[PDB]
């Protein structure tokens, strides 16, 4: 997994690959790793897949409860607090590693959240087995107050570095662009990897059948 | 409506008062303590000839050295009898000795007044029974009385139940310290005879003794007939 | 507080349970509901208390509930209490199937719910459920069956019975007309219309009929469409 | 949870809730038990409709293979007591490896009933029971329990509506001649019931289990 | 180690079990019975850890008997097998797991004969024949070789005898006698012990 | 390995307006085969099936506990469950046991009960859901199954072509697995019918 | 019949059970507290009901912390339990926060406990009022009073019991702010002798305690010799 | 601590008086109207105050909305529970809760307070609207926990008059634009500015309150 | 009554 | 105004669907004999209340009805004093807990809603009484500007341009209606009471857009307002 986020001039860009592995085998080629938290807040997930799925779903529904009550748009700090306090309670046994990004009344915010429940508020972050490759790109090329297209290019380069250098990463790049004015959930953004064409072509009755039962429906 | 733990202006617990009244609905039981042992006698009060007299059990063994006569609401007494039996066995287990008659009485009376609507599903009311504990320990033969209030006391001779006031008068006349056990058996049978509603025979009364010599002994039908003949 | 406690689970001086009796009063003012056993199935016939013109009718039924694959029921009394109890019946049925991997026999389902209702009359100091239920079903033990339960947690099996409004008048008509051991579903249907004709004070919008039959070793529970409920026209000829 | 003291003493030493429970018994159908020489018989009044399934509403029930009972009073309360006793019969077979004695299970039922007369938040059981069966040595047994938790053994007994009249009949009729044969033992039960009464009857013989008599077989005696 | 075997025929199930209770290097009992009567037409055969076997089997026994008393009729073999599995599976991850291996044999009036195999993990499988114990390793192939679904009760007994003789020949443990029972429409029948 | 104790293999495969699901039939304990007709695919509706590989006890428990929850759902809601909702219901059941999991990884195959649109997914043992448009595999020969499916699968296969593809994928995969096989059962789900076949297979 | 439960308002919005508990205070003999320049002094008219009692029996002055005194009026058993509540609250504060509880915070905390007994049929209001007094260099002298309703205020001077109104009249005559504790003990003794109804109740012991700069912020009984001087002053002042 | 006995019990005639008295609180409440159109549902209610500070028409989910007649504070409890029940459903099924399922669960909560210890019933009736299965829904839930599906109804003061007014002016083919018009007219029968009424709509795009500007426009008709 | 017998 | 059973003793419905115990709680607010006024503008929100110090032996600095809930939220309490303090502590708890869980300050509307929801429980559960008090909250909202909120013993709550509580609530509402910020609040309270205040006779609390922190005016600060209004 390679997941990453940057704060640009006008908001947040989140990125992710789309490979899910079981051992050293690819299980899913088109896995979605950018999770909805609220209309203004998204979250990339690495670590234990079930843990990140269930954790983001829970905080998302709690934030909907929160915002239905307040009548206000949720804050990134709220999502951050709710995630970290729950993860701390479980003492790292919930293996959710999260990149949380969003735009609220106080502007754009980006957090990294680790399974033990520590968080960092940062202008760029990476997580996953491909995180060092992605971080190399950020350290090399990140500048503050980037334009939207520059930030998109930087994040997609970071993910790509993970895709090509990390055995745990592959397939497509997904982006999520969050500003005050819009949300662009780009899935996929780029498809750097494609299966080659088949060189050889592969009748009814080839398989021998022992028993057959047909059940009509409706 | 009032609670179960309400005091009267005279400083009495109503429920305990009413429980003592229920003893007067019970059949007469008699206990006499001699230097030769203790005897317990109880009126069975057969209500129908179709009822089996042997299924009416108002004298029970607590342990080999302790018997117990009861009067009042008999169903209430069964849980008190069990507590006494278990407690004597608990004492044996721990201390490898027999529990004194006084200690058994004390343990049973600890249950009383342990009622109230404050769980969950604990005793809602006092027990409507009085008990005579008769046995032999190192202090010799001993008879104790306990009532629904949880008060217990040693008695030379005691009657409980409906006709206890009259029976107690008879007891105080006939009882003496040097009185033998055989006399005590005859005395209580004579007193039971006069205070009973039905005519006393071998099937409508119970009799048991505990002696320094031998264990708790329930008198058989034949043994009762011998005692009555006179 | 002993002051405010209405003491719902005590005996009266006659050995009566007042809350149970007052609950049965409530049921006597509920919509008429009757069930009839036949040789080839069971049926439930209910009076709709809905009746209003501006109602929407979103469900397949209003008073008839499926409990499992082989069982349905109908109710008379407090609607909300009926919802609690019918949910509980579904749970009991599923708990049995989990455990034994076979469907719960009809009487076992009735007994289990009646134990809950009985508990409310003996402890907890709560008001009982104000519901009588009619249960129809099939099992491998006794085939087609019809049961009735009341608020105290008493139940009984019936070849025909009625609960709710004018049920005394209905039970009279059943005694007269019900041919024990000779009833088909078509004749049972006829008798149901005939009984509801007298007790109800008839339209297809005002009644609800469900039938339970066996087809190819499988139970079929179906609520008759408005067109089939042709049955009202077939009676008026008689 | 609910902790109100329901059964309490009144000024004359009366437990009113228990006495009211006994009134619930009197509203119940009559049940008669007779202990014979080598047979025990239970008979109950049935009040029933024509449209009713007879199997479902029975007042005679097996507790174990060797023990069965009849009841009068609240039928819902009875079902609870019966199923409690049935569980206890199995717990006994488990722990002692012997079937329950008729007296053991009676003692259990009685103490259950007694507990519901001295527990917070509960009313007493509104049933009496007649419990029959045989012991190991083949002695026939008949016990009665009531709401207070009192139990006794009887040669013959009645509970429910008009129990007092039936009891007085049995007192005059329960002789050696009446229980000399199995046919006369069943007859005495039917006669006892016909004194206040459509009847259900069951027989239990030595190590032979409960047998419920057919309506055609009961019509022969009537 | 304890040995269990079952053979389902057209209208009967035949079952057998060893009669040894072992402790360390000694046989402590040579007339042990590993079969438990659940109802008139159901036998549960139980082996495994000491304590666990009798505790579990007797618990199921009393519950199957309670069902009959409550309902007036008996559990079917299939219902009893699933009940057994539910209990064992429920205890698997609890503080009180039961280390038992079971056969359940039964005859239903409508379904005919049935034989169920269950391991301590509580996996349940219906089988035409089955065996538990180390002895099963030496006998299952003899069953596979000779069994047919229409096997008569006479042949089933001789096929059982073949399996038992194989244990005498090839198995390293001393298992000299076996309980033998058959279940059919008429209930449970005690056959003669097979002895060596 | 706990997941290899009983062995087993299941896969699901997507066609044009149809789905397929297949399973081996072996029930074994380590090396020893016990039965050759163990059910691993359970109906969860007219056009919706779940197949479970892993620990045989947990296969049975999850099947039974899911049916419990589904039966209640269908009675309450008065409709058949959509395939995606069953996946969520299963995910929920498995994740409840996060810290003491069931040792089963199920696959779901069905048609939407109103649109008849094909759906396949799989879940891990703690209930992470994975929806695909091609195929899903689960069991002790997952690698063998991936190799066959990647090579043979084509989009928009008709029921007959889909049958052959999943049959050949399963047969040739399990034949390279010691603890899978002893027969293969295949269900083809269509709008108007279910077709159930057992295949001629090696019995070693 | 609106006066049986603290969970019941009367139609005019009163809670009579609390008012009835306050009556129990009004029937008690008088306790006074006076805050002066450099501390707080307490005095209690302690009625002698029997000559059989020991001199010192039924104390109505308590230490609830080393720096906090408490003076009570009303049902004494209820007062003693409130003294325990206060002690536990002061103890817990030190454990958690690591310093001596400020008097205002202690008053607030105990008052909220008192208040909790005015809401429910399950419990009855406390039949006692009490004063808390303390001194430190940082906080100065502080005197608080809590009543059965759970109301808590700070005072320059305070009285509770049956002669409260008469005691206040006397206290108002003092410029306590300018006076030392030594002078105040005499004035406290005086006021108690004035409000004492000699005709109705015979025999009383004067009970005196103080906390101030002179005791180094520790609540202590007034020394016997100083107490006797105050008694003599009060006696001769009364003529 | 808390009372364990019911405060709602059966009277000799078989009535639960506390529920009836609860319905008297409802009938004494401000009038509310619900109309199910062919392509939507509309909910409408009558209201120094800041009128935007509290709302009577409330979202439960994106597709479900609610209004009430009766006791405002009791309503807030049920709004919170309903929102919570909708989320608990979503967490399990990953699907928005069907309107009917939400009503059933909320009605179940209302039933509890007619039987549980030491509590009174809720003094509110609910109108719940929703859109699922490409179809509009309108439900009412009463203090007892009984629920009904309505094509159109009214509750609160003068509900009896409101219902017969609707019975005359409502047809099934009527669309949402027209349904809003007739809902306002129903409130006008027993009453008007855009500050003293609240209107919510429900269609394919979901549930939303009409803005004060939108309400002002409908009043111009 | 209906609930006795 | 009909009644049945215990509908005047506990919070069950009366025949016309009223809660008498709740109505009596409003009467309890007036037992204090004080009136409070709150008004908001574009720039600030203000609370003014009476300060009666009848005794003189009171330390007047400890006599207050103004309370800091957070740095940015103040409130004025009207009604029973001990009930009031209890509700203040609860508000402080809810506000602190909100900040801890959500990482931003509780909005005034949300704090008021929470307190109101708590009060609702006392109107539905029979075993406790409602609090005989009234809370008015002021604070600056980032988006909405100055806020004034009030909740009551019935569990009702609302935002206001201006509001009042206590004895002269209705008269204050009349005055404030006719007018639609610090000068307005003092004038309103002076009119309905017909007093004309000394600086020691009132308390004033303010929050402003420029200074969000809740502030209680000193005696000198209040005087400068009273002198200007003169
Ligand atoms: C609270 C305050 C307000 O104006 N409303 C609407 C009438 C409330 O319910
Ligand atoms: Cl934070
Ligand atoms: Cl990773
Ligand atoms: Cl006596
Ligand atoms: Cl089902
Ligand atoms: Cl046995
Ligand atoms: Cl009787
Ligand atoms: Cl489950
Ligand atoms: Cl579920
Ligand atoms: Cl209670
Ligand atoms: Cl909410
Ligand atoms: Cl909205
Ligand atoms: K209340
Ligand atoms: Mg890679
Ligand atoms: Mg173990
Ligand atoms: Mg293989």
Tab-separated table of C-alpha atoms and ligand atoms in Angstrom, chain A residues 77 80-81 84 111 119, chain J residues 103, ligand 2:
chain	number	residue	atom	x	y	z
A	77	UNK	CA	-9.902	18.051	14.338
A	80	UNK	CA	-8.806	13.280	14.367
A	81	UNK	CA	-9.741	13.274	18.079
A	84	UNK	CA	-7.010	8.748	18.032
A	111	UNK	CA	-3.164	14.396	9.797
A	119	UNK	CA	-1.245	11.765	15.359
J	103	UNK	CA	-11.324	19.253	19.878
K	2	LIG	CL1	-6.464	16.844	18.186
